[PDB]
Ligand binder design. Structure first.
Ligand code: ZN
Ligand code: ZN
Ligand code: ZN
Ligand code: ZN
Ligand code: ZN
Ligand code: ZN
Ligand code: ZN
Ligand code: ZN
Ligand code: ZN
Ligand code: ZN
Ligand code: ZN
Length: 577
């Protein structure tokens, strides 16, 4: 390609090209106002058009990283607003880009995007482009690793919502639903980027082999391998800020899947007769195909063949990749990480056994090594769903907050509350599902919440136990966290009465925000009395809840808090001994 920018502009079209460039700049530079970005986008886009007209024109042959980085490095008030990035701007490519990537903020702490129906409907109708641009901008800076094409898809849902409703109780629940999809989608992609960063491309491929084999059990190993190879490149590119290349390659992949859908899956038909953005999205979210009737017996190949040790030495990556493909397509009832743990156990067995005198007798029972690995997460999910269904989301979240605060009492209270609340919503999502889909739902979603915690820990490390669980092994991460008990080396956080002291401000809050305040106090209760049982803590929190409900129902709210509060604060400590 004579001009890469021209090529991507021609492939993607202007609207998508501008959208993706806006996303990319909003993620690299998270604090800049919407005007600093829009101007940069418009200027970049004008240059692309010029280059599309004449690819020999000066600067058109430069790399995307060079052009985009140079643009970012012109931004007004760079050192004051983006101290670390200004340092990156002294470098050449690709060092500069790598510097930009190293400095993306996963916890930027900006205001919650609260919907104002009247104000936004008014801004939408006067200038939709600006309004929809703003949505891309607001979400991108909040979620710096958000999948670029996915955000454009979600912007179009945002548009349909405002197009439908504006001509305001229509609008609020539509945006609530969309926000949950943004949260989930953001968490899924961040896991992919986190996997590249912390474990590498092999780990992302193995994860993808397992997942895609589950989704497309009809497809042969060549087809799955093909799709995994291409999908891994798409994510590598999107995770490293190469959003034009990422979008273009995602579009080509969707086309290939759809051209070969009879070979791949019967569920793709609904997806494949749609527009480019919608198509790629439906495929990424597609449900698992029905099991084929001709799935092969695996014992003969992987347990009983006499030349297995030779296979493992001569064509290791293919023998193991094939096993993972075969075992995964057969087990849609397993979580992805379980499948990965199974694959690692299979590999370790063929190392151990082949170094013995008589290997066949050794590796013959290899499938029986999987049994305890399957039973552990099955029991965990049964136990957590039993609790959820008994006590409901709020108390379930509370139990998880206690559980995780005991494991990592050095973690910040907002982080512990966030993660406990997220973990508890997994119950609501997964426990009601058909019984065979609970395990994959529960563990896969758990992987997302644990990765969020790990990502926050990269920025703000407080705990060696957390470091170990986050960095030792991607497949073993959930069981590593599950095996943590009360950190015995923790010295209890000192008592501050005011931490547990409530005031009449709580009464005006929305329900979820009242809960967060009480849940924060719950975390703090555990930090000061780490040996207190979950049953002690539930009772103490019950008493706090009753006290809040009483004084919020009072004629004089603050006199109630001022009278009743200090007694409850002192007595509650005696209950936690
Ligand atoms: Zn090229
Ligand atoms: Zn597009
Ligand atoms: Zn500026
Ligand atoms: Zn968000
Ligand atoms: Zn989505
Ligand atoms: Zn993807
Ligand atoms: Zn790149
Ligand atoms: Zn053989
Ligand atoms: Zn799910
Ligand atoms: Zn207060
Ligand atoms: Zn409440």
């Amino acid at each position: 390609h004579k001009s890469e920018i021209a090529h991507r502009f021609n492939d993607l079209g202007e609207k998508h090209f501008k959208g993706l460039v806006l996303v990319a700049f909003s993620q690299y530079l998270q604090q800049c106002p919407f005007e600093d970005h829009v101007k940069l986008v418009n200027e970049v886009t004008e240059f692309a058009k010029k280059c599309a007209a004449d690819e020999s024109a000066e600067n058109c042959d430069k790399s995307l990283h060079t052009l985009f980085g140079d643009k970012l490095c012109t931004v007004a008030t760079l050192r004051a607003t983006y101290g670390e990035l200004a340092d990156c701007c002294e470098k050449q490519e690709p060092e500069r880009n790598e510097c930009f990537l190293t400095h993306k903020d996963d916890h930027p702490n900006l205001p919650k995007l609260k919907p104002e129906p009247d104000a936004q409907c008014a801004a939408f109708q006067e200038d939709p482009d600006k309004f929809l641009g703003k949505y891309l901008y607001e979400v991108a800076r909040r979620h710096p690793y958000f999948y670029g094409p996915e955000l454009l898809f979600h912007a179009e849902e945002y548009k349909a919502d405002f197009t439908e409703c504006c001509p305001l109780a229509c609008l609020i629940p539509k945006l609530d639903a969309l926000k949950e999809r943004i949260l989930l989608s953001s968490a899924k992609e961040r896991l992919k980027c986190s996997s590249f960063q912390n474990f590498g491309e092999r780990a992302v491929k193995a994860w993808s082999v397992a997942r895609l084999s589950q989704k497309f059990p009809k497809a042969d190993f060549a087809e799955v391998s093909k799709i995994v190879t291409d999908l891994t490149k798409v994510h590598k590119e999107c995770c490293h800020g190469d959003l034009l290349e990422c979008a273009d390659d995602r579009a080509d992949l969707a086309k290939y899947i759809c051209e070969h859908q009879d070979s791949i899956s019967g569920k793709l038909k609904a997806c494949c007769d749609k527009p480019l953005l919608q198509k790629s999205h439906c495929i990424a979210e597609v449900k698992e195909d029905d099991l084929p009737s001709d799935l092969p017996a695996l014992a003969a190949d992987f347990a009983e063949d006499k030349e297995i040790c030779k296979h493992y030495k001569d064509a290791k990556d293919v023998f193991l990749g094939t096993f993972l493909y075969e075992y995964s397509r057969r087990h849609p009832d397993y979580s992805v990480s379980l499948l990965l743990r199974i694959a690692k156990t299979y590999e370790a067995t063929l190392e151990k056994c082949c170094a013995e005198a008589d290997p066949p007798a050794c590796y013959r029972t290899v499938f029986d090594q999987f049994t305890p690995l399957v039973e552990e997460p099955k029991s965990l999910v049964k136990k957590n769903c039993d609790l959820f269904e008994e006590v409901g989301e709020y108390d379930f979240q509370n139990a998880l907050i206690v559980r995780y605060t005991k494991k990592a009492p050095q973690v910040s209270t907002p982080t512990l509350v966030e993660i406990g609340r997220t973990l508890g919503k997994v119950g609501s999502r997964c426990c009601k599902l058909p019984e065979s889909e609970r395990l994959p739902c529960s563990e896969n979603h758990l992987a997302l919440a644990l990765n969020r915690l790990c990502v926050l820990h990269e920025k703000t490390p407080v705990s060696e136990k957390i470091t170990k669980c986050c960095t030792d092994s991607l497949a073993e991460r959930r069981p590593c966290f599950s095996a943590l008990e009360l950190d015995e080396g923790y010295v209890p956080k000192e008592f501050k009465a005011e931490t547990f002291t409530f005031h009449a401000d709580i009464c005006t809050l929305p329900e979820d925000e009242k809960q967060i305040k009480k849940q924060s106090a719950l975390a703090e209760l555990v930090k000061h009395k780490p040996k207190a049982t979950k049953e002690q803590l539930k009772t103490v929190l019950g008493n706090f809840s009753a006290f809040v409900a009483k004084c919020c129902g009072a004629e004089d709210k603050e006199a109630c808090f001022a009278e009743e509060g200090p007694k409850l604060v002192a007595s509650s400590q005696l209950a936690l001994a």
